[PDB]
Amino acid sequence: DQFRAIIESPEGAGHVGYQYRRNTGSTMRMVSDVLDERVSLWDFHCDPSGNVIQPGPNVDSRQYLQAAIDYVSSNGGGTITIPAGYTWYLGSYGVGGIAGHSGIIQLRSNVNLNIEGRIHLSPFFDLKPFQVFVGFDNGDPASSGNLENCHIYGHGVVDFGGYEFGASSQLRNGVAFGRSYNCSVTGITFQNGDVTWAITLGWNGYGSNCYVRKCRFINLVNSSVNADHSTVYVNCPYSGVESCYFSMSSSFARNIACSVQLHQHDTFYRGSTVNGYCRGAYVVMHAAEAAGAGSYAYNMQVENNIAVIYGQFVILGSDVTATVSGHLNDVIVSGNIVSIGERAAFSAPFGAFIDIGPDNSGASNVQDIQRVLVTGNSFYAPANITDSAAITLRANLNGCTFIANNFDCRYMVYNAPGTTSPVVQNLVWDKSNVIGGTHANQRAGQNLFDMQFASVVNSTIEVQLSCEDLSMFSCILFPASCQLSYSKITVDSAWTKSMSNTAVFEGNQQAGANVYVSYPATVNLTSYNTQGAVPFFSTDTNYAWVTSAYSLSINENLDFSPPATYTNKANGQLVGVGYNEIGGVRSVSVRLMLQRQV
Amino acid sequence: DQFRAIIESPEGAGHVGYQYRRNTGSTMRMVSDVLDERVSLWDFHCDPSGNVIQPGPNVDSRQYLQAAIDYVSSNGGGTITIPAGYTWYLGSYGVGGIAGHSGIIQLRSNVNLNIEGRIHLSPFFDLKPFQVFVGFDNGDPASSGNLENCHIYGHGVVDFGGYEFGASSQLRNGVAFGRSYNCSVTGITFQNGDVTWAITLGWNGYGSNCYVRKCRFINLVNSSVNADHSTVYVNCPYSGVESCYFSMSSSFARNIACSVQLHQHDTFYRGSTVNGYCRGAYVVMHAAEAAGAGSYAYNMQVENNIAVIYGQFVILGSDVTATVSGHLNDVIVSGNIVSIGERAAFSAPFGAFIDIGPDNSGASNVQDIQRVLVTGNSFYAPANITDSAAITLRANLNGCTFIANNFDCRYMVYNAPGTTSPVVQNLVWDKSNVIGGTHANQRAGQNLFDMQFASVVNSTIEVQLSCEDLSMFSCILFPASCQLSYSKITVDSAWTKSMSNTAVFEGNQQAGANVYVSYPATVNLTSYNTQGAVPFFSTDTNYAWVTSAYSLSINENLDFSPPATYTNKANGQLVGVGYNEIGGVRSVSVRLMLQRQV
Amino acid sequence: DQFRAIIESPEGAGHVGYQYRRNTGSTMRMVSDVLDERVSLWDFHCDPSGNVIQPGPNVDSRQYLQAAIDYVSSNGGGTITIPAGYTWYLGSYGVGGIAGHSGIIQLRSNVNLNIEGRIHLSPFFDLKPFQVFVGFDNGDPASSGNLENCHIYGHGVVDFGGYEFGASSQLRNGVAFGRSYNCSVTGITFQNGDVTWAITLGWNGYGSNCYVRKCRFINLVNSSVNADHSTVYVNCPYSGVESCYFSMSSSFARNIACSVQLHQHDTFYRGSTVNGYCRGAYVVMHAAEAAGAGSYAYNMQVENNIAVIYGQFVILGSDVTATVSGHLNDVIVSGNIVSIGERAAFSAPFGAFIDIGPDNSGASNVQDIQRVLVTGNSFYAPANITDSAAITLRANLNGCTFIANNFDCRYMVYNAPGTTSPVVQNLVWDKSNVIGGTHANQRAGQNLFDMQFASVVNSTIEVQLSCEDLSMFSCILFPASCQLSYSKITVDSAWTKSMSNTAVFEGNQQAGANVYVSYPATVNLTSYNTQGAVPFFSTDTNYAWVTSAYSLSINENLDFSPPATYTNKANGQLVGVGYNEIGGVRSVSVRLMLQRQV
């Protein structure tokens, strides 16, 4: 007997008996069986003789973490703890199937990581691409197997070491789950980098039930080299982001960074706070990514978020390839409170709550976006920020509905003249959208709704001001190049009495058979001489399209009154019947509500 | 001394000393004390001699799990881990108080289960009833004690083994918490079954603070035998479901399955995604379940959910027994984006966003439902689905308010003719509800708002179209059997110019003293011969109820104009004063806005 | 050799070898290394000889918990478990930097507490102040260092022992995180006390990323001595409360308790349920607390909560000190369903959904509150509760917008006469707010919108009733002392036909140049004798301000008709042109819609 030698060997714990709480009905086990119920990096962080190695800036922990993942996977899975109170440095690339993804660690199905300590990237990675955790098992994703049931969670940290990108063409990621099913990241802080993304869920539609919750993403763009950034990229359905925090402090992030991109159906972005980013969320169906879950992005939800951004909050898109056409529909944007941060006009991408953006090539005639509801959001831009819109409508739009929002910025609807000429269908701006007054007196030469489109059909614009802004050129203007048909355009009279122009139709498009319109105008009239009931007629003949008009002015006169209400005549005059108590030709200038078919 | 024998016995770990991290200020303990801080199924999964047994398809793990729960309960509670990397099969029924509930495992207060591995049901259960985890301690719930402080959580799985029900009368459940206080399920996947429910919280109002969060429920209906299904049943107050995922793929689920039923006050269903179900949520006060928390369901919230369903999204109800009357009030439905999945017309229960349903016996005259707010939701049904409504209003309704929703389906308000004749009070349809155009041109013979009721009082219907649909018979129709009083009914003129019928009152109900109405109509008028101010009068005498009317048509004429505005006469003609520049009898057909008291 | 003595000593576990699962590639460790991966109170709950002490009502566990926290902190952090199945009593105050805060336990950075058992306060604390867990390290917070990365979580309980406050001037707290960065409380129940707060996040703006989630707060006010209570106090930015439950049962809580106060920018309160409280949430920028995060509270969100309260749901405020001015802006209140619980009129603070409150001194002329959006909420008060308002507007207001809410209570807008005289700008009440009928017939002598202000500018009140209430004195009244300018005030005619007074302007303020108004009135008219087109004129001369008016009454007559539409004359009469088929002086009383500039 050297029981003593056994006890001191690595098998010693397998010889020391244990029964839970001295319970005679419990299993008769050995200490090693109970200790085997859990597993940490420490169980693999050793030299070839089995001696534990201390982590630190001059130790590459990657091979030890991989060994731990590879082993737990072999037993059907479990959860490996990355211990608290230590920083574990990664200092070399992985090998095999993840090498094509500049992968550091390969994730494996059913193997969870409980990250309590800190994972840091060593300077080996400075100026290089990297993707810290990769779930593909093959360089070519199309030939990759899946990652299932893989969760990363804890109070720990992933720190990208502050290193800048070496070249704009490089990619960097934190967690690339691959073709991912029931995978998640919960509680982790991702910080201190220059990366493309922090987490990507799914791969071109392949994946399901992937989620990012209660995570923090802090200072993840730091250079002019970085081409682009979207902090969480959701590229599988039935997946989303909730209750996260996103913050950036570099100037470059104001111009290139987006918090989330939702690229597949039944995805969501909720209850998060964003600060310092260019963009809130892209909601898009890219044809080039339609392989796993179909050609439609539908059931897309952006809800109850708080954002301070420099560019656009939600960007809608869809596009085509030679062989696939992408479609976007059935979207809700609700409950968000968003502002454009303090900045000079035009110093960052054009500020907007909703942007209908062109494709990556800049095409504006490929999109099929419809059945979008934008409701119960607030938006605010400071008064100096000329380039701020409720919606920048820069590409073809097949429908978008606004109800009960509060927009307080320079423009309501905008698209630049002399740029794209979008085809617009089913734009619905309900009268319950409240138009703020922060930009009152700043709108010289500007149209509040600047309808710079090829055409508008089946649309509703119900303008309601809630304060005066006599600087604006018009509440709404259509250039002559914009066709307008089967539409309803109204300007409420409140706060408009002193406006020269309320609604402007540069091609007289309001005359159209199925155009329904009402807006204030000032009209000069003259009556016949007759005592008693007497007609008054407009001097100008521009009113052939008017079905009725009524007075918005008081009558200062005792001896006569103009008509309360007017119709038209074939020559384009208005006509109504007033009353001369005493006879005489009368001449008056009156403010009328002009109406056509309403 | 055989210290050696002691060390190798089950008491051995109780003789090996330990002090945390060699800290001289730490407790001097033994290894067994530290190991006793945690507990797993392995500590009870043993034969009568204490030898561990491996789980698997031919091992019934139920008695061992029960022993573990029973023991931990005896020490005031704790958390038992069901280890990862193993499947633990259940293969027999429990005994005692849960036997009346076809119970497998009895839950006990303060004893949590951390389910990391998989729990599977063995074929013993095929064609039989079962309720996997039961929190009652008595066959009769009325005599049951409570379950408190019992949480089930982890990354693990409950798999129901795919077995079909043996008979429609059978019940099956996953987690029946019983009379449950501060109990929860978090993170678990429930899959592969034919069950009635996955989780039930509470028992006829008894319970509090019970929640289902971040769970998945997948393929839990699979046969024509299954009578009914509601995945999470909330039958105690201050309780709810959030951030879950629900999916079904069988045809039968499209016809019988609901994701959630909320049956008591201060309950919620939020931030979840549903696919493949008949129904989203029932929100109901069943008198037969009013014992623990009173006769009122109030503070009911369904918010920010994503759903593809085949029948109805939210179903409202209340009913009575011989001795109790149930009441439903103070409900909010908001932020939801819901569609009816691709299906033939009438191939599944009638598609609806809100259904006011009859009781289980089919009675429509027992309900007391009021103070419901439906706001900021989207709803869409494909164009072929005739049986799609914003609201199917099939039983008595004491109030429901719609504001700022987007409904894009066949009907807005519907109830079938020749079925129930509901009594309707306080139905409020605000003008900010946007009516979509997906079903344009499909509505031959149909009324968009088909008011097939006994009576309507204290209601508001403000119809606003946003595109043309000249196929419809009318925007809104009241049959002569429907009384209408103290109500406001308006049809906006936009997109209505070519409609023969806009609003239709088959019993001339718009004449009522306290009916306030406006809608377009085409009216033929004829004038007197007189040069100058001249009256025009309607040919028909159907307008005794009209307080004013105004022109919606242009005047093609030079030599005269009809009145811009009209009143009536006792004989039912309209009359207004136009103008003849030259004399002559005039005859015109004009589109007017008819108004009564507005 | 006494290997035996080594094995039985506290170093024994450090001599027993272990290799994970017998894996030859795993680290060769000792049992003590694996046991050192975790830590509990048991590792410090010992006498000076190292013998474990059992917790209980006669053991003060404070020094042992502190030793554990102090030690784990020294190794860079980790998580200490407070074991399940035991109650751990605290029975003395802490010492050092927390003594000035009546502190019991000092929290330390990176040291988490996993509270599974129960923490109770011993009677030592009866009638005394206490703050159970404190994160400051100094008596003076301005000289305190920070607390970082400190999370408290588990299924456990903090029980305050039921003790009443000894004096109103005392303070009590559960968790005072101090100057707190990335700190949280998750899952804990706080119960059975008389305290000021349960959790405070941050200190006068210092802090970030602090959160309270899935916690319960039960019966935390119990005496008339308690001065005030706010259950969670958020005093750092990028921080909030979600998915919590709050309940009180004492009468005193109905009068003094608030669930949440949000005091810094980018903070949120969501998805929670409140019962038995006076107040939901204060949303305020207190100048006296502006040191760490600036003088502005902006991006404040209160969303998707369920509440039964006795006073006010959301209270807005801002104030000044000698040297700082606080500002409140960019607030959203949405998706909440709130009611005033059953109580007598005036038996608790005045019931309101939104209150614009004076400062703590009662000043109403210091506030700078603007860009608030209140949308898609429900509110209900029982019919007897006279003191219930959608908004009690008691201090200066620079803007608040209401869209698509359902308010069912006594008043819509209220402020008491003979109290404060607020200056109001940019109050926007959209026509999509639905006014309920619960208080119909209770409003004798009352104005639904009682505009008891110094002045109103740039505001919109669009009144729409949905049932009759002929008890009210007026839908909206402005006293002569209230100036009114650049505003839009409309009363829809539905349900108003029998009202003597609809809108009332006691100083004839509707005459103002930039006041835009429309409301029903009854007007007596008389015509001239003339056969044919004939003028009708109002008897009264009160209509100099009317731009147009139109009939809301039918014409019972055959031989004549009054004008459909009217304008005015300089003498203040209305005039229109009707028609006498037969001649004669006519005299009629008609209901008109009076309009000014709309």
Residue B100 C-alpha from the chain's centroid: 30
Interface test with C, best of A33, A333, A435, A495 (most C CBs within 10 A): A495
State the CATH class of domain A80-512: mainly beta
Secondary structure in 3-state letters for A569-582? CCCCCEEEEEEECC
B195 Cβ under 8 Å from any chain C Cβ? no
> Which residue out of B275, B498, B554 would a mutagenesis test of the A interface target, given it has the greatest number of A Cβ atoms within 10 Å?
B554
Q: How far apart are CA B81 and CA A20, in angstroms?
A: 14
Name every chain C residue with its beta carbon within 8 A of the beta carbon of B593.
none
Residues in chain B closer than 8 A to A434 (CB atoms): none
Distance CA A548, CA B563 (A): 10
SS3 content of chain A, % helix, strand, coil (to 5): 10, 45, 50
Residues of B in contact with C9 (CB under 8 A): 17
For chain A, positions 234-263, list CB contacts with chain B under 8 A: 238, 242
| Residue A71 amino acid letter | Y
Q: Work out whether the CA dihedral C76, C79, C83, C88 comes out positive or negative.
A: positive
**Measured between alpha carbons, how far is C283 from C340 in angstroms, rounded to an integer?**
19
Sort strands B515-527 and B532-538 into parallel, antiparallel or unpaired: antiparallel
A548-551 and A565-568 strand pairing: antiparallel
CA A32 to chain C, closest CA, distance in angstroms equals: 7
Instruction: Kindly give the residue spans of alpha helices, DSSP state H, lying in C327-486.
Output: none
Closest alpha carbon within chain B to A514: B495
* Dihedral class, residue B90 (left if φ above 0, else alpha if ψ from -120 to 50, else beta): beta
H or E stretch at B376: none
Residue with tokens 């027992």: B366
Question: Quick check: A504 contacting C, CB < 8 Å?
Answer: no
Q: Show the beta-strand stretches assigned E in B116-163.
A: 118-121, 130-134, 147-153, 157-159
State how far the Cα of A70 lies from the Cα of A279, in Å rounded to an integer. Answer: 38
Minimal C-alpha gap between C211 and chain B (Å) = 18
Which residues pair with residue B566 across a beta bridge?
B549
Q: Cβ contacts of residue A45 below 8 Å, gap of 6+? A: A52, A53, A55, A61, A64, C27
Nearest to B221 by CA among B165, B155, B264, B140: B165
CB C406 within 8 A of CB B372: no
Helix (H, G, I), strand (E, B) or coil at C74: helix
Distance between C456 CA and the closest CA of chain A, angstroms:
12
The number of residues making up chain A comes to 598
Please name the member of B1, B31, B303 whose beta carbon is closest to the beta carbon of C31.
B31
**Breaks in chain A after residues (C–N exceeding 2.5 Å):** none
Q: Please give the Cα distance from A342 to A210 (Å, whole number).
A: 35
- Cβ count within 10 A of residue B528: 17
Domains of chain C, residue spans: 1-79, 80-512, 513-598
Q: How far apart are CA A122 and CA C471, in angstroms?
A: 77
d(C-alpha B284, C-alpha B318), whole Å: 5
Q: N- to C-terminal Cα distance for chain C? A: 105
Rg of chain A (C-alpha set): 33
Residue numbers after which chain C is interrupted (C to N above 2.5 A) read none
Q: What is the DSSP letter of A345?
A: T
Q: Is C335 on the interface with B (CB under 8 A)?
A: yes
- Give the separation between CA C242 and CA B185, rounded to whole angstroms: 18
DSSP B234-268: E-SSSEEEES-EEE--STTHHHHEEEEEE-SSSEE
- How far is Cα B174 from Cα B179, in angstroms, rounded to an integer? 16
Strand, coil or helix: what is A247?
strand
Which residues neighbour B459 within 8 Å (Cβ) at sequence distance 6 or greater? Answer: B424, B425, B426, B427, B428, B429, B487, B488, C466
Judged by CB atoms closer than 8 Å, whether chains meet at C112 and A155 is answered as yes
> Burial level of A480, CB count in 10 A (0-12/13-18/19+)?
exposed
Instruction: Determine the distance in angstroms separating the CA of B543 from the nearest CA of chain C, rounded to an integer.
Output: 10
A489 → chain B, closest CA residue: B494
What is the helix (H) or strand (E) element at residue C396, kind and residue range?
A: none
Choose the CATH number for B1-79 among 6.10.20.90, 3.30.70.20, 3.40.190.10, 3.90.1150.10.
6.10.20.90
| Dist CA C596 CA C598 (whole Å) | 6
Token representation of residue A76: 């059907």
Question: Does the beta carbon of B454 lie under 8 angstroms from any beta carbon of chain C?
Answer: no
Q: What string of DSSP letters covers B553-588?
A: S----SSEE--SEEEE-TTS-EEEEEEESS----EE
Closest CA to B88 of B53, B45, B55, B42: B55
What separation in angstroms does the CA of A153 have from each of A112, A156, A185? 8, 8, 6
How far apart CA B347 and CA A278 sit, in angstroms, is 47
Q: Which residues contact C58 (CB under 8 A, 6 or more apart)?
A: none
Closest CA to A427 of A447, A408, A455: A455
The CA distance from B431 to B413, in Å, is 14
The answer to whether the beta carbons of residues C445 and C418 sit under 8 Å apart is no
Measured in angstroms, the CA of B145 and the nearest CA of chain A are apart by: 27
The CB density around residue A524, as the number of other CB atoms within 10 Å, is 12
Among B residues 41-60, those touching chain C with beta carbons less than 8 Å apart:
none
Domain A513-598, CATH number (from 2.40.30.250, 3.40.50.1240, 3.40.50.300, 3.40.50.2300) = 2.40.30.250
Contacts of residue B513, defined as CB under 8 A and 6 or more positions apart, other chains included, come to none
d(CA A83, CA C96) in angstroms, rounded, equals: 31
Taking an 8 Å cut-off on Cβ atoms, the answer to whether B76 and C85 are in contact is: yes
For residue C561, which residues of chain B lie inside 8 Å, CB to CB?
567-569, 575
In SS3 terms, C229-270 reads as EEEEEECCCCEEEECCEEECCCCCHHHHEEEEEECCCCEEEE
**Taking a contact as any Cβ pair under 8 Å apart, which residues of chain B between 151 and 170 contact chain A?**
155
Q: Specify the 3-state DSSP secondary structure of B13.
A: helix
Residue A360's CB: how many other CB atoms inside 10 A? 11
Tokens 């014409």 belong to: C555
What's the half-sphere exposure (Cβ side, CA atoms, 13 Å) at C399?
Answer: 22
Residues in chain C, overall count = 598
